[PDB]
Amino acid sequence: RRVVAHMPGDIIIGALFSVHHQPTVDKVHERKCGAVREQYGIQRVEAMLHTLERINSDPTLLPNITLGCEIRDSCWHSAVALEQSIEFIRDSLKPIVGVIGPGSSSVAIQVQNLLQLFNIPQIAYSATSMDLSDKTLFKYFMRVVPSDAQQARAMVDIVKRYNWTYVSAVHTEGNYGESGMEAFKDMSAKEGICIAHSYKIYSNAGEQSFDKLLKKLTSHLPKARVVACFCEGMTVRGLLMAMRRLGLAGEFLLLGSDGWADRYDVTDGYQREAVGGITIKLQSPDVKWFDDYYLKLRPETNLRNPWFQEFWQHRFQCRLEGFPQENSKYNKTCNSSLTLKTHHVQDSKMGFVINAIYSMAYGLHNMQMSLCPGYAGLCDAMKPIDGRKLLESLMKTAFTGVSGDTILFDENGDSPGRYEIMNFKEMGKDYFDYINVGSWDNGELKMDDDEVWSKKSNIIRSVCSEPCEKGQIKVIRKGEVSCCWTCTPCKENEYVFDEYTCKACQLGSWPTDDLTGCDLIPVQYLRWGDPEPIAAVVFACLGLLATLFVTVVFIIYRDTPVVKSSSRELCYIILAGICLGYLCTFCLIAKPKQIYCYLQRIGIGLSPAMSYSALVTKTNRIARILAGMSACAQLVIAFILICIQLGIIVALFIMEPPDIMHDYPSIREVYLICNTTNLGVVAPLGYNGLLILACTFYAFKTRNVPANFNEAKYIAFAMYTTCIIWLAFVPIYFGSNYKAITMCFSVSLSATVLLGCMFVPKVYIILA
Amino acid sequence: RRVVAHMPGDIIIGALFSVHHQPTVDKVHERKCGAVREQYGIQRVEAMLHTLERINSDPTLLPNITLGCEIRDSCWHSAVALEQSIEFIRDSLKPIVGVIGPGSSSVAIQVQNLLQLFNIPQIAYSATSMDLSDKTLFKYFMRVVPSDAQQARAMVDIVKRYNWTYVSAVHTEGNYGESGMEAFKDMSAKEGICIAHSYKIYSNAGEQSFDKLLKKLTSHLPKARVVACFCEGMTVRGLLMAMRRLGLAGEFLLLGSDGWADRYDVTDGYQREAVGGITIKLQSPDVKWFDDYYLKLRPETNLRNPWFQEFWQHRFQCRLEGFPQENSKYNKTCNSSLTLKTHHVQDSKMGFVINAIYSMAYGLHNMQMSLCPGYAGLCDAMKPIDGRKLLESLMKTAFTGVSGDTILFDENGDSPGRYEIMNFKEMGKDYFDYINVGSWDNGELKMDDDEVWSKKSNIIRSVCSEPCEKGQIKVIRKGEVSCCWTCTPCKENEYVFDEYTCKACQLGSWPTDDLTGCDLIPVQYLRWGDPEPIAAVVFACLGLLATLFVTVVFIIYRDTPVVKSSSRELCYIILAGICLGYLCTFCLIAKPKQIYCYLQRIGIGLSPAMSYSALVTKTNRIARILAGMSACAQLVIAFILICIQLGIIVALFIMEPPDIMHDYPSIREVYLICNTTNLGVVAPLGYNGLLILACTFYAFKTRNVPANFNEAKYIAFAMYTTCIIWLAFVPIYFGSNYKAITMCFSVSLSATVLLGCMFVPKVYIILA
């Protein structure tokens, strides 16, 4: 049978401390546990044994009655703990009023399942899983530490503070690890953090299992550089040993938890490989009187602790020949000059242990005051200590702990606490230490960023993709996870408005330089400047000068035989036509307005009509007198021709209303032109074409008949050239968007011809 | 204290049956359990009590020693089971050699944790979670049923067979639910099934909790219509009651598990709400002799079962006045005419129970044979039955079950088994029943689709995304389950590369039919067909005929002074010019090849050079005769003019060589054209322009020359016409492209202009 500690008393309290290590993977069934522990073992046992004596000596708490204890070894294993708990409850089948719960959460759950049947309150000091907070399943359980909900919140705050997005998660198999990592996963996935892969491993797994786990961790090495470890000390140590074996010292950042905390025994020997690791340690100041008591302990004068001699041998590698447990495995013998002071560290959760024991004692005390106030001792009503009443008192108890602060239990039996964020750093040459780099308390994370990463080149941010919101490139998520994307450039037509989605603008808009939202593209038009329009207006002005010169010559030589046969009225009509033809050039090249549009249509439709309508009748009169009514009748024929033309124009004007249109030929450029349908343009052109065809027929009929210096031949030349000119611009016109400019050129050419291949001869004669 | 069923024997085997219901959420701490169960309670208790006596009577198994039992009630609760297991082991602190493990997995885990410390083999009959398969943690645990891995695989097969992609998951709090749903989630997400949201709920949760769960289920109702339930009977029943309360009458399909199976107690009264539900039942044939024994049981003659009278009262609502357990709560009394035959169903897992009991018997038998071969009974070495040897024998034992098939245990203590898929259907009016609609064995899912959904209108496929595999439209995801997508059309340029991305192909490329890929665009060359090229070739051919006719005529009268106007060599240079001018049409209008693009440039640049060079020299001789050298110098001057032309054209040829070049005007259409640069076309054209303008300056002088048939006038006509015609094609050429065709027409006509006005005057004379 396993050995246990004893201490006599009126009320006997139980305790489960992991004096020995967890049983090896091959020896779990035998249920024998390995090496003795100092921080987790002998220190806690001695702490309990001394705090009990302190309580007994102190008259203000639990007066006139002694408090005894029964310490057993759980070996940090659920099965060993269950057997020891059976040994506790064997008396129920001096009673154990309560138990100071085991370190592990899963072990605590097993022990609690057994204890709650016998109404034995269990106060833990390091059980942190949220599962134990449920008082329906675990009624007789309290703890002097907060749950790991707060620890998961702390880890996620630390991860988000450094914008770590793509992390890898490891948690120890059990209840602490599983619950911790479930909480972390929830809160991280909620707030943008993405987990590369969540792994699990047993603390007592072999070397090969840790090797395989680390290989899987390296499978996402370049990107996922931070491993959030909701792991125990031994899991972290296993990962460190794996890093040693496979040569991975110093490219992973291990974000630990309370399992790792401040422990030197998890990073001794393997300091080089855990440098930079960030851990979360429950805040607990060193208990000074415990150190004063502990450091003076000697193996000769300490008999009440059955594991103290084994601890003495293990710590200082030696053999004590004067004791039954010689343990001749060790080579040397230890002289009576070795002390615990050399290389002494007090376990971080010592305070909590003392608090837990006090939490019980005060509880009993409160019950003592409430159940029989008068008697200063174990009254008749107290002989069978009721576990239910003790649970109630323990629930409502409050006092001042060894640390100094007050401690209380909430509705779920937890206790308020804060965390200290620590970083494992290298200070000197071959000297590594834990450095306090921040705190976390009720949601607020305070952290120095100078002590950790004393440079702008910190650990490579655990991000699965560079921030791709640089210009036209858009984020596409490949299903991998929200946090691993690739990148596709969005085209110039479209704009990005929300991530993952870029859409095209309608027809006359263009994206801004920032490439968010599209604005209105500036509208281009006929541009009074520019070489082409200025050349057009130059030609138009020269044309106008020629027209006015010709009209002057005509009007100052009226009764000259040169202009005798030619109907003066017909000539007037021709000159007016040519003038308005030239004018509509300026009427075209301008800022498109309604007054400009309607006038340009009338001008273009009328001027050819007005010129050629009189021209045809003139040629007809000549051809008829050759072939051998008229005068006024000639004028009325010309006038009815122009009348039907004007009727057609006004009809088209009414049918299709003239308005300023914003044409969009391509996706980039926008122009404004006045709404003139295909029919709206081709109708005047059609009519004028019929007119010119009739005119060429009649001119060809006349051809080269002798006249007043033979005008007919020149008129025929002009008619042929003007027909050619009209036909020339058709392909450039009817399948493009240079409407106005080419119309300007066309009309200017078609008038210069007439004003030239007519009159200009006559002017020469006038000069002669 | 709780009552326990007894049967005396030499070896006592324990059992834990859920005789009563689970304690209510309010009465958990008191640890009192509710109403008595028939299928899971009295039937299993009576089955064990009868199977043991059957074994005792049978001499071939366990001869000469009797097998007793101690049956206890676990009330389907971990705490009650743990206290009853403590009652089992109390004697070890006549020994309980083994227990027939409790029904639920979580309860089995607690009991196993306690039992393995005392080396008591535990054979379950319905514990199915995978967690119990781990023999490191649970060494003394065996089961006569397969693990939940196979069941999760069965559910995944069922969901994938009906293309249910977007399902919602519910699982009962515990281990069976938790482990089952983890397995389902893993393999489903692996294959492609999608979980809308995974919910968890306690079996004994209040009505409010089930209401909230169902509200959350309906929050994803239109898209997630299938709920995969890894739940117990009571969880499913709670969901059905919730559906009744807030009005669901066939809106969800509940895909159940072993917990639901074919149980009537989960759907009795609430049949309308579970119609269409598909469940998975472990295959086990009904044990007939159990029914024969059970149906004859009376409360008067059955004393060994302490719960039988309570069961009698609960089943047939009545009171037995003739027994101490009157239970006066019931109003009426039971007449001696009530039999269990009325409305009798045997629980689905009866076979497994009897197999487990037989398994323990056979284990003991094998040990008895191996340890004490000679002695027919408990030998001296067998008096303290070692649990280790028993576990070993139980592990290696195999035999024939009640069903008929052989029973064996694997390395993990499991047993082979197969599943039956059942569907809850309505046959008659107010008549609902479970129908076997399939089976599942070692990966093979064989299931009839006629009995379920006897029509083409089955349940709406649980998909959150209408399959938009309709050619052009692609899939884009958006922060959520990579399972629900929005469909966006890709544009005409691009093709779908992978269903999540569509990319644009090359400049000269187009997507194929059904958007499978981008192929090469056909080239739309200048084909010999079509009206325009045919007309061009017609004109070229008539030009050739005219040229050859003229050259014939010219030699017919070669020296005659009538044709001997000027150097007759010039009037051969011009003929050659016209000929090769026409010949260039063919090399300009054919398939663009290297040789043909070589020839076209030379032809186009060269022909006008020679024609107009000879013309200009002729005009120079005429102008000299008017001004009043000539002789043969004019040939050399024409030759040096051609020399400068050929220098220029060859220089341009060298600077930019004609090759095969692919123009891309738009993204859709492509052509093949020779890469004659803009400079390459404007430079020879520029020179020829200079030549023609000057040839007119000279013609301007020669208007009125009385000469040999007055050639000068005709040449002036030709020169004016050719200048005009060159001017006419400016808009169509520079502008709407159509380079080759327009050039063909231009060169074809400009010759006829000369050949038409220049020469045939002389030929006219010959013909007079």
Ligand SMILES: C[C@@H](NC(=O)c1ccc(C#Cc2cccc(F)c2)cn1)C(C)(C)O
């Ligand atoms: C550009 C376009 N030309 C015209 O649509 C057009 C319209 C009118 C005129 C004229 C005139 C004129 C000329 C002399 C006197 C007079 F009164 C009027 C020319 N071209 C097409 C047909 C494609 O060549």
Ligand SMILES: C[C@@H](NC(=O)c1ccc(C#Cc2cccc(F)c2)cn1)C(C)(C)O
């Ligand atoms: C289309 C284009 N025309 C030409 O680039 C071009 C080039 C060559 C000719 C010719 C000729 C010819 C004429 C007679 C005899 C002979 F041997 C050759 C015409 N146009 C422009 C100037 C825009 O009209």
Ligand SMILES: *[C@@H]1O[C@H](CO)[C@@H](O)[C@H](O)[C@H]1NC(C)=O
């Ligand atoms: C993380 O937060 C933002 C990310 O854009 C950045 O400005 C900041 O420098 C990052 N690092 C720290 C230590 O905050």
Ligand SMILES: *[C@@H]1O[C@H](CO)[C@@H](O)[C@H](O)[C@H]1NC(C)=O
């Ligand atoms: C979907 O289910 C039907 C039969 O239920 C059958 O077409 C096939 O199994 C599935 N089809 C697809 C597209 O997966």
Ligand SMILES: N[C@@H](Cn1oc(=O)[nH]c1=O)C(=O)O
């Ligand atoms: N909360 C932890 C406590 N703990 O675990 C370790 O490995 N060290 C340590 O302090 C647990 O529940 O296990």
Ligand SMILES: N[C@@H](Cn1oc(=O)[nH]c1=O)C(=O)O
């Ligand atoms: N398969 C369940 C057992 N079980 O759950 C029920 O609801 N009925 C039933 O037999 C388990 O493995 O725990």
